[PDB]
Amino acid sequence: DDERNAFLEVRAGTGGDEAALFAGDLFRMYSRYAEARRWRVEIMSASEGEHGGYKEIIAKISGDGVYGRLKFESGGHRVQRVPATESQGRIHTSACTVAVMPELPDAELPDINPADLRIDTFRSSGAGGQHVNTTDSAIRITHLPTGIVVECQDERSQHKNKAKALSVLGARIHAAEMAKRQQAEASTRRNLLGSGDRSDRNRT
RNA sequence: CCCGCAGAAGAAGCACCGGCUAACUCCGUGCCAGCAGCCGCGGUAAUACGGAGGGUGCAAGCGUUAAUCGGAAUUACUGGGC
RNA sequence: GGCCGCAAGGUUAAAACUCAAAUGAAUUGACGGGGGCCCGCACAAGCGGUGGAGCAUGUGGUUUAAUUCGAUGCAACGCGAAGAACCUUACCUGGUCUUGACAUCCACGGAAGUUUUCAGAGAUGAGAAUGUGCCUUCGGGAACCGUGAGACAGGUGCUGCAU
RNA sequence: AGGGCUACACACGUGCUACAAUGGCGCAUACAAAGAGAAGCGACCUCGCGAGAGCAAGCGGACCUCAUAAAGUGCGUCGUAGUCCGGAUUGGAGUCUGCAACUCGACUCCAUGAAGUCGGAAUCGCUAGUAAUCGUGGAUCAGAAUGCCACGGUGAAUACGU
RNA sequence: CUUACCACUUUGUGAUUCAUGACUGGGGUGAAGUCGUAACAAGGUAACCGUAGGGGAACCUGCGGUUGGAUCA
RNA sequence: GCCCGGAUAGCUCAGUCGGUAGAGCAGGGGAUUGAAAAUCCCCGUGUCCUUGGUUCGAUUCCGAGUCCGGGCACCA
RNA sequence: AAAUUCUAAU
RNA sequence: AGCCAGGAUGUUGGCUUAGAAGCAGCCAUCAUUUAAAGAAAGCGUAAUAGCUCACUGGUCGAGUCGGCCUGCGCGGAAGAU
RNA sequence: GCUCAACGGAUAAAAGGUACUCCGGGGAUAACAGGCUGAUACCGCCCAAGAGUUCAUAUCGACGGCGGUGUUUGGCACCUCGAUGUCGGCUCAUCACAUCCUGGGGCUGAAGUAGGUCCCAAGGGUAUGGCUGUUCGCCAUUUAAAGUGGUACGCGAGCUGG
Ligand SMILES: [Mg+2]
Ligand SMILES: [Mg+2]
Ligand SMILES: [Mg+2]
Ligand SMILES: [Mg+2]
Ligand SMILES: [Mg+2]
Ligand SMILES: [Mg+2]
Ligand SMILES: [Mg+2]
Ligand SMILES: [Mg+2]
Ligand SMILES: [Mg+2]
Ligand SMILES: [Mg+2]
Ligand SMILES: [Mg+2]
Ligand SMILES: [Mg+2]
Ligand SMILES: [Mg+2]
Ligand SMILES: [Mg+2]
Ligand SMILES: [Mg+2]
Ligand SMILES: [Mg+2]
Ligand SMILES: [Mg+2]
Ligand SMILES: [Mg+2]
Ligand SMILES: [Mg+2]
Ligand SMILES: [Mg+2]
Ligand SMILES: [Mg+2]
Ligand SMILES: [Mg+2]
Ligand SMILES: [Mg+2]
Ligand SMILES: [Mg+2]
Ligand SMILES: [Mg+2]
Ligand SMILES: [Mg+2]
Ligand SMILES: [Mg+2]
Ligand SMILES: [Mg+2]
Ligand SMILES: [Mg+2]
Ligand SMILES: [Mg+2]
Ligand SMILES: [Mg+2]
Ligand SMILES: [Mg+2]
Ligand SMILES: [Mg+2]
Ligand SMILES: [Mg+2]
Ligand SMILES: [Mg+2]
Ligand SMILES: [Mg+2]
Ligand SMILES: [Mg+2]
Ligand SMILES: [Mg+2]
Ligand SMILES: [Mg+2]
Ligand SMILES: [Mg+2]
Ligand SMILES: [Mg+2]
Ligand SMILES: [Mg+2]
Ligand SMILES: [Mg+2]
Ligand SMILES: [Mg+2]
Ligand SMILES: [Mg+2]
Ligand SMILES: [Mg+2]
Ligand SMILES: [Mg+2]
Ligand SMILES: [Mg+2]
Ligand SMILES: [Mg+2]
Ligand SMILES: [Mg+2]
Ligand SMILES: [Mg+2]
Ligand SMILES: [Mg+2]
Ligand SMILES: [Mg+2]
Ligand SMILES: [Mg+2]
Ligand SMILES: [Mg+2]
Ligand SMILES: [Mg+2]
Ligand SMILES: [Mg+2]
Ligand SMILES: [Mg+2]
Ligand SMILES: [Mg+2]
Ligand SMILES: [Mg+2]
Ligand SMILES: [Mg+2]
Ligand SMILES: [Mg+2]
Ligand SMILES: [Mg+2]
Ligand SMILES: [Mg+2]
Ligand SMILES: [Mg+2]
Ligand SMILES: [Mg+2]
Ligand SMILES: [Mg+2]
Ligand SMILES: [Mg+2]
Ligand SMILES: [Mg+2]
Ligand SMILES: [Mg+2]
Ligand SMILES: [Mg+2]
């Protein structure tokens, strides 16, 4: 079904130096909940918040049944209380933003299967004498699925050009796929997180 | 226009009640929902939001929006200043 | 945009948008690494300590079924507590009760109390003798008991930012 | 009814005892103030190494009890060593209060004998019968103070100055 | 029939006005971020004006000017 | 493809001369402050890139391998 | 003679 | 080898899922009437239904079905005056 | 008394450029083309885990295997250095079939229109432009279709010279 591990990250919203304290308190709450469930919590990224807790904490929770119970904590959490960084005795309202995202794999494959490649061999252009004329040293590879084209005529040997262009095509495919995944994840996190403004909230 | 007929028989709504501005209490929500012409209300004991009871102002009308003059001596001839 | 200048630029001179203010003089305080005059074991001169060690005690944190609650700059921390084995105790686990542990009202059968026996961790439940009197117009009423309903009791529950 | 507030990798505050010779240990002997006492204070005598136990007068108290003050002084030993300093921790046997001392009391005897050899950055109290040091009593309380509130003994150094 | 005037229409080259344009320069607004502390007291180097150079930024320095500057027992 | 150089704490980096590894920043505890910085005191390091070998003993010496940095790849 | 800072509801 | 006939009984099974009934996939794979019939070799239904095959009686009437050691041939076999 | 280590040691004593070049030779030796080969390139076939809702072979084919051609890049250095002119375009062609269209069929997860795949077949036919010196390639608009290759990767005693 859906019981995979999860990533929990909380960051400050409105308030500044006291939203960091509330983020620390909220992280401590979640950590104690995880500990009294036979789960495991480990901190990957921490940005301390000058006075108190963390301006942003990103940790990974691992167990059986994690995401199925922590997927409802993604949103805004509002706190109304007397801050520690308060000379007078005023009550202040602040907020924090929480994001919970499931753990998903990173299956990457060498999508360089030659059954879906078009290879063109032709003559290079430049100054090479009577040998550059009567030889097919320039190479070009077109990837049928993605549609990327890479052409190479660096060295006099066709095999070196073929290898170099094949490596460049693989690198370009990898970069495109990684950029796609990164933008999808960023958009999902942006929609899940919200914008800490003490007016969009899930609990008080 | 005049006379007769039957029966009170056929005929009341709109805005507002914190100050400016005449007119107050209860319940619901809890910087949310909402109100506002200017100051400004609402953070779990709200005469300012929503409903009820009461009151105030106009009335076959009542309110809102647009436009002009006045207040504005705020282009100062009457009648201002450095 | 125009004029002037080698250039740096000068000169004439708007609009959109945004706020409900911006400003001058003086007034009462507060503050100054501004100026004078003073005081306090506040500095200076001395004496003895604390921070190091072992132990007592309180607090934070952590743990736990609970580790009850409050104070938590100077002005909280041998503080409320002028004294936690049971009690205190307000916390946790388990076993129990519902006008009721603590008061008044109404009705019904009752002197109050003394010795015991069985079951249970105890709360409690069941059983048997024992005294059945005290002012009482011999109508009765009354210190005090159990039951039956409800007006009510009960709260160390929250708000010291309503008092 | 039983348990917890007494937990324990750690951090802080307030204190008690020490790190020794201006001292430790043994023998002998001087000088206080204040306070409490009836389900209470408890003398004498006897038993026990000791905490204590048995019998038991007096006292609602300038009369009786708690209740020998200690530091001090005289003599002797220790002779600078982790020691005849230090008294933590642990094993065994007991006394008392309390129906009930395992978690969780106080005291006693025997055995044991840890850190500690004067304390980093820092920081606290005190101007005279004060600081320092030595003993005594009371409230709470069946039992349970190094805490709190009081009482006396010995008794200093320093203040050019703001 | 022919000539003159002239409407529609056509050609070339300018002016002005409206919308739009890849990039680029500043301006305003913000109940929370990063870097410092330039000004308000002598604001800890008195402040400001004109000008020139420099620098992540408030700003610093050179020349002239002003008091709309504190202390002066 | 050939040649040279490098790999050491969390990050930038010195060092062996075959037996015993350091510096700055950072990190932990405590001081000063109403509080955060600056400042002061105390405290901790790492299988010296992977693998095989010689040695009593390898971070060091000798073979391979991975990654990083630099140079060259000309006449037709 | 040294010496930076104090967000956001009374 | 052709040709007639059978090819049955409580598995609508818990297992698994909306239904999986011989035939989606997972374990097992016994028993009964029999001359024979798999608790199923194949086709087919959303699941049923439906049609064949293993095995067995009848006709027929004499040979028939697979391996081994070897000789020679076939396919696999498309290029530029 | 020499790392005369270029170790039978040329002098005690010594680096580079030539696209401004020049002489004597070599196909004893490279670049173009031909030749042998076929690592590479391209095209077929064998077995069948599997994908195809179920079903290996409608259409694909993992792990492996066996061949063909002489279009690419190579290996060798057999011909040519007393000379075989080298890319692209133009004009003109000619052959192979591993067939782009038209022609005849089998199977389809082929209802029809349209397709997929494999056989037979070489008679005829098989674009104009933008960009670039371009071969190659991208784009615009047509066509029944805009085939793949050999010929010194055809064709300069036929043209041009980017
Ligand atoms: Mg060249
Ligand atoms: Mg060639
Ligand atoms: Mg009024
Ligand atoms: Mg209104
Ligand atoms: Mg209300
Ligand atoms: Mg209302
Ligand atoms: Mg109202
Ligand atoms: Mg006017
Ligand atoms: Mg007006
Ligand atoms: Mg005026
Ligand atoms: Mg201008
Ligand atoms: Mg100039
Ligand atoms: Mg003003
Ligand atoms: Mg003023
Ligand atoms: Mg002053
Ligand atoms: Mg002053
Ligand atoms: Mg004094
Ligand atoms: Mg002093
Ligand atoms: Mg200590
Ligand atoms: Mg507490
Ligand atoms: Mg105290
Ligand atoms: Mg208790
Ligand atoms: Mg009060
Ligand atoms: Mg409080
Ligand atoms: Mg109890
Ligand atoms: Mg306690
Ligand atoms: Mg007395
Ligand atoms: Mg001793
Ligand atoms: Mg003892
Ligand atoms: Mg002893
Ligand atoms: Mg002892
Ligand atoms: Mg010593
Ligand atoms: Mg004294
Ligand atoms: Mg400043
Ligand atoms: Mg300064
Ligand atoms: Mg300055
Ligand atoms: Mg200044
Ligand atoms: Mg400068
Ligand atoms: Mg200047
Ligand atoms: Mg100046
Ligand atoms: Mg620290
Ligand atoms: Mg800052
Ligand atoms: Mg402030
Ligand atoms: Mg053959
Ligand atoms: Mg031929
Ligand atoms: Mg030689
Ligand atoms: Mg030689
Ligand atoms: Mg030459
Ligand atoms: Mg020559
Ligand atoms: Mg030759
Ligand atoms: Mg050749
Ligand atoms: Mg399948
Ligand atoms: Mg050839
Ligand atoms: Mg060849
Ligand atoms: Mg040759
Ligand atoms: Mg040879
Ligand atoms: Mg030849
Ligand atoms: Mg010749
Ligand atoms: Mg030649
Ligand atoms: Mg031929
Ligand atoms: Mg054919
Ligand atoms: Mg065809
Ligand atoms: Mg066909
Ligand atoms: Mg033909
Ligand atoms: Mg023919
Ligand atoms: Mg013919
Ligand atoms: Mg030919
Ligand atoms: Mg040619
Ligand atoms: Mg050709
Ligand atoms: Mg000619
Ligand atoms: Mg040329």
Tally of extended strands? 8
Helical fraction equals 25-40%
Note the run of SSEs as H and E.
EHEEHEEEEEH
Rg value: 27 Å
Which strand order spans the largest sheet, edge to edge or round the barrel?
A: 2-3-1-5-4
Shape call: elongated
Helical segment count: 3
**What percentage of the residues does DSSP assign to strands (E)?**
25-35%
Q: Based on helices, strands and strand pairing, what is the structural class?
A: alpha+beta
**How would a crystallographer describe the biggest sheet?**
5 strands, antiparallel
CA-to-CA gap between the ends? 31 Å
Report the bound ligands by name, code or SMILES. Answer: magnesium ion
Domain Prokaryotic-type class I peptide chain release factors: 123-139
Main location: cytoplasm
GO molecular function: translation release factor activity, codon specific
Keywords: Cytoplasm, Methylation, Protein biosynthesis
Describe this structure in words.
- The modification N5-methylglutamine is found at residue 130.
- GO terms for molecular function: translation release factor activity, codon specific.
- This is Peptide chain release factor 1.
- Keywords: Cytoplasm, Methylation, Protein biosynthesis.
- Residues 123-139 form the Prokaryotic-type class I peptide chain release factors domain.
- The chain is of the alpha+beta class.
- Helix content is 29%, strand content 29%.
- The chain has 3 helices and 8 strands.
- The protein has helices spanning 17-35, 67-70, 158-193, and strands spanning 6-12, 40-48, 54-62, 75-81, 92-102, 117-122, 138-143, 149-152.
- It has a 5-stranded antiparallel sheet, with helices on both faces. It has a 3-stranded antiparallel sheet with strand order 6-7-8, with helices on one face.
- A hairpin with a 5-residue loop joins β7 (138-143) and β8.
- The longest helix is centred in the last third of the chain and has 36 residues, at 158-193.
- It starts with 5 loop residues before the first strand and ends in an 11-residue tail after the last helix.
- The site of one magnesium ion has 2 residues, from loops.
- The site of one magnesium ion (MG) has 2 residues, from loops.
